[PDB]
């Protein structure tokens, strides 16, 4: 079966729609997510036109093998989609209405700069390659673009599912390709990060600062070194949920900066002890008293600077 | 093959049933579970009706390809089900009795608020899309809804498997859809959490409170900081078994609150030491003696408040 | 093709056999194991009977599509088995001899009460569903039940592979089902647990008891708290290899009990220090000397009680 | 299609060959590895014999469906192999030359006794089941047995790929089976284990022995207990890369033995402190000075004994 | 269908091209990566040649089954590729233009010597096996070799995608094989390793060196032993992201060397304490003051040596 013939030198328009049924398995590290949706297609093929009286049916149901179906693919998928044809209906002017339900693992990069207060635009690219007989162009039927109410993605808020109505028509290997961009807008549910990572991380840091109210070097060393190890544990935990990025993330910046605070706290505790041993506790007392104010103040200001640069 | 014609403008009723054979792989983080079941379907096709006297046979067995079968799908599945037709039997009046055995990975969100003392309602949504010739409606045959006795789900008690008998009939892409809700009620076996997480967590916390019976700052620092690290280990272990939720869980709330108890214990140990060094051990003794009562009392009351808010 | 007709109102007996070739991937947490085996089937089809003299051949080989084959399934499988027909041979009296090689992931619950000194009976349930024409019953051909010598399951000893010869004949969805139980008896190789978990766990516990030969509170606190943290590590390691059970396991009981020993050791170390500070070291010495005997004695007796209750 | 008829009562010889193209995914814990190879088969079918003069062609190419092909399988595979026929060529005398490219996951147990200085023989068992018409025997064509130069297995040295030329001919379910053993000899690249596990483990152990040059009980307790915890971490790391074995491994033996050294070091540190407190430091000094020599000497000799028993 | 006949004894040239659409899942440990691409093939079949005037059409479109297509495979793939034919076009002179879209998991070893400042050349080997009728040789059509702009690989910079135009023609099992090498050049984004592993590792090491400004043995032991444990954590973290190599990596070398620095620091802290106890603090002070300079100087020089040897 060959493609439908043109009335004039016009290309064949294949109207498309995607209705999301199930959205799942957003793998942040992998930049992959799985989708289960309806894919609707519509085009005009005058070779299948019919007169109802002779046929006895107002619309005909064809099997995919019986008629010409455009070879529609997704660009940003791991493998060819898992598709099951639901319905093929032909009107007697030859307007075909195709519907399939598919599942596919989609590849769409994520921007982690504001993690875990980040938002993303997941893309689903629909494509058709033109044939030698005719050029095929994709169009959006907005009445067939949407998502189920129950659609959920663990740890995310689903904002919108829309299509950029104008296709990207270009040449690939001396043939026209017509590409459509379907956009799924999402925003991370940051809530959990507060009681699970941010506050525990702040608690251990503030615990290290109690060394500024102690002259016991041995206790101070135990305080700063133990809390540092706990900070290392949180750093490792965070980087297991994140991919390696060629940029700094918001959380990554805070985590990194906190190491500097632990490093200077160890210097303070060392300087304090050295002075005490040298019989200079008055100078050591001045440094410890200043540290009581300096450490929280510099921590607060540096965080304001970070929040400002990132948001 | 076209759908059965109506006697009047009535829709086609397809009676359904699901009998669970094997239930497994409940992935809490993923909100997915796997199912292996019988799917029974029943409808009337007058074109298939026959006289038992003339034909000789009481029932006719058909191959799926030979007759019209409604296109039944699951809404909340990752991929199309793995199905194998078991039997197709037709009665003399044209009543078709269809039976298949299928396996599918179902997507059903879980409420973790009362974790690990939580109960869940897993859903299995059956759906049919209406055709241009006729409208198709789903119904429940209660005699064909059930589960095997041996059905088990590791770490859960299976309470019931029932169906909401009235379908959700709605329009999707200008066609009637008839959706049925099959509910699998389960309740978590909390037992194991007690000796494995709750009691070990309480033991380390109570170990930190021994610092209220010690004047040794160095030992106190070792006691509170070491037990805090062990609490961090348990917090990390718990959050690896749970997804990120936009709400607080019961366990999450207790775990978070325990950090505050460790934080105040560090303050007490610091205040005590500072006073001793300042030659004020009488004031320090009053604070330590009060802490011996205050810490368990505030811990007990705060837990009563939490249990009340969550249950 | 319809089922063979009865001589009288007798049911059709399908003789079965399972010969294990490869056994692998026993997932303790999941209650799943993978199997690769021969499935042999035998029944009489009089319609297929022939005269050896007239036909010339002693046996006739058929393709599955050419003759009636019973629809045999496994009850406790994740998905329908991966099967490949090896041979179909028909004898002159119409006795069909069917052989296939299959692979399946089997679901069989495990009893962890005596872990890691536990034994299990893995089940493989064969089933046939009766048809409207006739009732089908399963039987065991003991000469076709066995396993390869090389069959191994990492961390287990394979004891036996036998079949319960009498089927469980019952009604499921108003049709007779004939179910056969194939049993694979296994016993865990506990060896490794001794040098890897049990002895290291005992060593750290005995290390904590050295605090009963020390008056240094700071060293005692370091001894008991550090070894407790190591015990927490072993507890976490153990529970990662085990599912969450609504009962206590043998290892779980020992692990839990050891927490109580650490808890009382912390009390002893605290009481000892408090008394020393109060200028009562003679009373403290009596408690420490008693602890030297009490702790190993109570540990030994409590273990005898546990071993008795569990074995 | 039936098997080739015999000239006399001789069995049909199917010459075989396996040429490894890609070898990957050796899972030590699972005893599985994946293979991608050419499988060559050759046999004589007199019914396919032709005159080169009359036919014109020197060789005839057939599609698998057109001629009789022996049913060849692998014994120790998880599932049936993924195969794609490359070529079927028939010579004038009726000698068929079959070639396919396949991929399979092979199950072959490993001996971990000398880990990580162990060598293994991975097996690939080829098999044919005899038919009622004729008996089929397997043979090795050594010119069709080999491996690609680029063949690599991460962390291993590939030594050889050979076949045991004489098959194991036996009866399974009253039919002859002809089994061939293909052996892939490999030897572990131990290099990495030295800087990553062995030397770090020795460093922490030697760090614990510095307690023999200290009278500070508190520092000694910190030294031996901290290094023991680090040894526990290495023990856990090692057992995650290894399956549970019913025998001792070389590394397992060294790791276990090192626990005894830590245990005796804790006894020494305890005895030393007890004596000092009892005003017996002269006796304590004799024990500590002896320990300085005894610990490295006993460690060196015990290792010589272990290396001797294992190699 | 047989291969095209030669005009003379010349081999059949099959022009090839690969256009990368999606590149993903680079598993460093496994030496595997997944690819989604267009595979273009072109050859001349004179038997398919036609007159444009007589036939009417300028090009003829065929279904794969209808004409002779060369059997093209990939050498270094796990399984046979997942392919879907897009277009087959025949020009009047018989020049066939074939296009398919495929996905495959490719096996390509990586050189970790300069990790994480390493670059790699991923290989995709295209191959054709000659037939008995004719010899088949592969060629590169450079106009059909490329990659999509959007192509990305998390944690990597994609440099180029080119082909070695001259094939590796060799004999395998007495038949010509023509192999083409497609090279995907990538370079690791080392950025993240700096704040996540390198700087935290340097911070803990520098924290251990504060013991050179302290006479407190107990605090020194806590400082060096605690930071060593944190270094062990980072060593374990690094080796989980890397495979076991028979060579030293850059990071591996630095990590290993840092153990020696911790070992000598423990010796210094021990020697210092021993001397103090022996009433020789003047000699101990000389060693500690020298260590303050020696440790950073030797660390800096050893790193210059390492960087020089590795880059
Ligand atoms: C006045 C003292 C300030 C010390 C500042 C230390 C800066 C370290 C820079 C690291 C750059 C990366 C190498 C680690 C040395 C730690 C410093 C020890 C301080 C001793 C105090 C003695 C009191 C006189
Ligand atoms: C030390 C701890 C540092 C925590 C910094 C607070 C988070 C923040 O400031 O994050 C900023 C986010 C971003 O939300 P947005 O809508 O994407 O902002 C986009 C705004 N533009 C378009 C103008 C740039 O605000 C929140 O989620 C606020 C609630 C989180 C508070 C958590 C406190 C603990
Ligand atoms: C009377 C002293 C009360 C101290 C209360 C501390 C409140 C901290 C609030 C954190 C909020 C988030 C920053 C950490 C500082 C720790 C407090 C050290 C106390 C020293 C006591 C000295 C006795 C005179
Ligand atoms: C500090 C440790 C805090 C532990 C809190 C106890 C658990 C609790 O109070 O949880 C409450 C659960 C919930 O059972 P439910 O039937 O779902 O309650 C629903 C009741 N409504 C419908 C009225 C809201 O009760 C149990 O499982 C009781 C046994 C667990 C005891 C474990 C003790 C350790
Ligand atoms: C004779 C003293 C016995 C102490 C027994 C402690 C029982 C704790 C029960 C917990 C039940 C769950 C809360 C933790 C407090 C630890 C006890 C501190 C003891 C101090 C000794 C002082 C010596 C005069
Ligand atoms: C503290 C450490 C406690 C260790 C308890 C020993 C194990 C035990 O006692 O386990 C008991 C097992 C069970 O063997 P069974 O045949 O199933 O007993 C069934 C007997 N009936 C039918 C009478 C009930 O015996 C063994 O495997 C013995 C060897 C293991 C010794 C390991 C010592 C370390
Ligand atoms: C002379 C003293 C030798 C000590 C030998 C210890 C044997 C332990 C055997 C364990 C077998 C399993 C239970 C742990 C006790 C640790 C021993 C404390 C030693 C105290 C020394 C006091 C100096 C007089
Ligand atoms: C404490 C640390 C103990 C380390 C023991 C060394 C390893 C060993 O002795 O292992 C022995 C291996 C085995 O090599 P093989 O050819 O299989 O021996 C077979 C010989 N027969 C046939 C005689 C039995 O030799 C090596 O790989 C030697 C190099 C490794 C040195 C690593 C040192 C660190
Ligand atoms: C001057 C003393 C130098 C010590 C050098 C130590 C070399 C260790 C070589 C390890 C090779 C692998 C076995 C560990 C012993 C640690 C050394 C204790 C030093 C005691 C110092 C006493 C001061 C007089
Ligand atoms: C102690 C910490 C050691 C850190 C060593 C620095 C890295 C290095 O020196 O790595 C070298 C890399 C390699 O880049 P290249 O182009 O492949 O060099 C090839 C050059 N030839 C052809 C001459 C061999 O340079 C970089 O990425 C430089 C930036 C990284 C700085 C990170 C600092 C922290
Ligand atoms: Cl697609
Ligand atoms: Cl479905
Ligand atoms: Cl089955
Ligand atoms: Cl196979
Ligand atoms: Cl391929
Ligand atoms: Cl050659
Ligand atoms: Cl050739
Ligand atoms: Na078509
Ligand atoms: Na049908
Ligand atoms: Na059949
Ligand atoms: Na300590
Ligand atoms: Na065949
Ligand atoms: Na072809």
Author numbering:
A (entry chain B), B (entry chain C), C (entry chain D), D (entry chain E), E (entry chain A): 5 to 315
Text lifted from the article:
Each subunit consists of an extracellular domain (ECD), predominantly in a β-sandwich fold, and a transmembrane domain (TMD) composed of four helices, labeled M1–M4. However, the GLIC is a pH-gated channel, activated by lowering the pH, with a maximal activation at pH 4 and a pH50 around 5. We instead found that proton activation is a complex multiple loci mechanism, with the key contribution stemming from the coupling interface between the extracellular and transmembrane domain, with E35 acting as a key proton-sensing residue.
Mutants of E35 are unique in strongly increasing the proton sensitivity. Interestingly, the structures of the Wt GLIC, E35Q, and E35A at pH 4 show that the side chain of residue 35 is located in a hydrophobic environment bordered by the side chains of P113, L114, F116, F156, T158, and P247. Interestingly, E35A also produces the greatest structural deviations around Y28 along with neighboring residues. Altogether, the data support that E35 is a bona fide proton sensor, whose charged form stabilizes the resting conformation, whereupon protonation favors the active state.
